[PDB]
């Protein structure tokens, strides 16, 4: 939070290295996801020109995204039993439920794989299905984000068809992992990708006399006030609300200034939500200053981290993701 990073920076400056240190404007780690499924199917190439893994990526539901995010399923279980878990929970298909392998980031992050939407037998020969090259290749290729080097989350990829090398000791057996990476998020970026900002749950306690001031100072910062609760005991009482972590900067100071020190708030990480806008958009004019309250602050919010440590812009799917021959 703010105060944690304050005490970090104080101990960094005046205790552990007494050289003067420039800081930057605070900004959040933010995340990537998809909104609906694909509108085209992917394509592959290896240096042997041997593979063709064509596939898609579709969303999940947010509750099970939290579930696999919070170790509700574990990889140590029985294959049929975790299949039964996801089967009887998400009313999933029976043949595809047991077909899974290890999950997304850290094998815990909700970017799971299902091999078997489209029919059960193609190859199964030596690799033939995703065992170590594509699993660890996805691990190596899901922590480094596709669209603006920020992680995907709550988007699952399902392989539709593929092929093995003739003898992957001789031909490509370690030369399909970067193709696997490239294919998976090629299928991601064609599917209308979106970003996710974190929200903070904020709990205010505040006297009743200055309680519309907190409505104004979080409503200005895009805050959905959920619960105003007169509490027993304290005449001051609680507000519970949601604010973006990019608009939480100087929050409790602003709140505590407008209420002349009577109100007080605390702030904690809630689950991620969708920024108003699309990263893929072009013909979209971003003034350098003047923050957007607009429905297109997401394009700003991603180009201004590609303008950072970043990459080059213009992420339309022609060059590194696809091949219009």
């Amino acid at each position: 939070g703010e105060l944690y990073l304050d005490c970090v920076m104080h101990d960094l400056r005046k205790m552990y290295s007494e050289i003067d240190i420039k800081v930057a404007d605070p900004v959040v780690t933010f995340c990537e996801t998809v909104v609906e499924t694909s509108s085209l199917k992917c394509f592959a190439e290896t240096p042997n020109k041997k593979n063709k893994i064509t596939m898609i990526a579709e969303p999940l539901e947010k509750g099970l995204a939290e579930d696999i995010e919070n170790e509700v399923v574990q990889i140590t279980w029985n294959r049929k039993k975790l299949g039964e878990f996801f089967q009887t929970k998400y009313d999933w298909d029976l043949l595809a439920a047991r077909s899974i392998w290890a999950f997304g980031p850290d094998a815990t992050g909700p970017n799971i794989l299902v091999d078997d939407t489209l029919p059960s037998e193609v190859d199964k020969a030596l690799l033939g299905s995703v065992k170590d090259s594509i699993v660890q290749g996805f691990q190596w290729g899901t922590r480094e984000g596709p669209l603006c080097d920020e992680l995907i989350r709550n988007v699952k990829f399902k392989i539709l068809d593929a092929v093995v090398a003739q003898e992957p000791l001789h031909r490509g057996g370690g030369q399909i992992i970067p193709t696997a990476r490239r294919v998976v998020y090629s299928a991601f970026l064609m599917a209308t990708p979106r970003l996710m900002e974190p929200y903070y749950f904020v709990e205010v306690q505040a006297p009743a006399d200055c309680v519309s001031a907190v409505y104004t100072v979080l409503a200005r910062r895009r805050g959905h006030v959920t619960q105003d609760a007169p509490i027993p005991g304290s005449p001051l009482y609680t507000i519970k609300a949601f604010i973006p972590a990019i608009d939480s900067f100087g929050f409790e100071t602003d709140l505590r200034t407008h209420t002349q020190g009577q109100a007080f708030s605390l702030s904690v990480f809630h689950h991620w939500q969708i920024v108003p806008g699309d990263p893929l958009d072009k013909s979209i004019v971003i003034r350098p200053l003047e923050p957007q309250p607009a429905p297109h602050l997401a394009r700003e919010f991603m180009i201004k981290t590609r303008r950072r440590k970043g990459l080059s812009e213009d992420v339309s799917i022609s060059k590194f993701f696809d091949d219009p021959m």
């Binding site: 027993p232 005991g233 304290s234």
Partner: protein, 292 residues
Amino acid sequence: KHAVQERLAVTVCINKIDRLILELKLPPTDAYYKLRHIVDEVNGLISMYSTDENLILSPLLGNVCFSSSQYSICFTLGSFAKIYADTFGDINYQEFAKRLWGDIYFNPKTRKFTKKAPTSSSQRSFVEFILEPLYKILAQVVGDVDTSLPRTLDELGIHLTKEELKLNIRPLLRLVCKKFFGEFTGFVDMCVQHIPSPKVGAKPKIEHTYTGGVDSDLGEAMSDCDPDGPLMCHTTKMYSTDDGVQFHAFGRVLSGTIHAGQPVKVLGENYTLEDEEDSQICTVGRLWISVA
């Protein structure tokens, strides 16, 4: 939530009841309503993740002790019926102590702690034997420091001399209820009731913190020092020294002992997949325990 996710022993010491009653100035029955509400809310909040459905908390289980750290009072009834006992009681507490919460006492027929109100305005036993006498100590010391305070000191049997009675009203309060309540007996009896006093609750602990290790590490981590086991001691924290550049790490010992400069096999977060990629084994002959 993070504690029962680690299934630790969730006991509770709710605090600032002086701030409940010197400051919000609640009548005793409504103070009981607030405390019953807050214990019911933490009970219904613990029973949101019901792997331990039997485990609830109440004062009668010796599971919650009230307090005021401003004036240093321990409270709870298993320790308070001791102060009923050592002066003028001969009560034989912990059956009397587990009887005063949520049931109504009445003065004739000398005791039947009913489920009903004998008189149409009958305060409970918690707001006739324990809470409202605390009100009378507290209100008579911060309202009547000149009159009626030697009467309540003569009744409570606390002599207190001319120098220490000339204090300001807040330190005088802290001293008078410190000499009344004595020592923190409620906080240690709340820990006889729970907090499983290790090698007894060590099984979910060593299960959750270690990765398995049955027949190699599990049975010896369940054991104590008795110096035949491994060393195998955890370390989560790293305090600074006064000069700052020296760090002193800090953690719990589970089965073993360190004396005088033992070579120390320092594991790491990903140094040991099955074996140490690095240790940099250390020789440390100073280590000592911490207070504030």
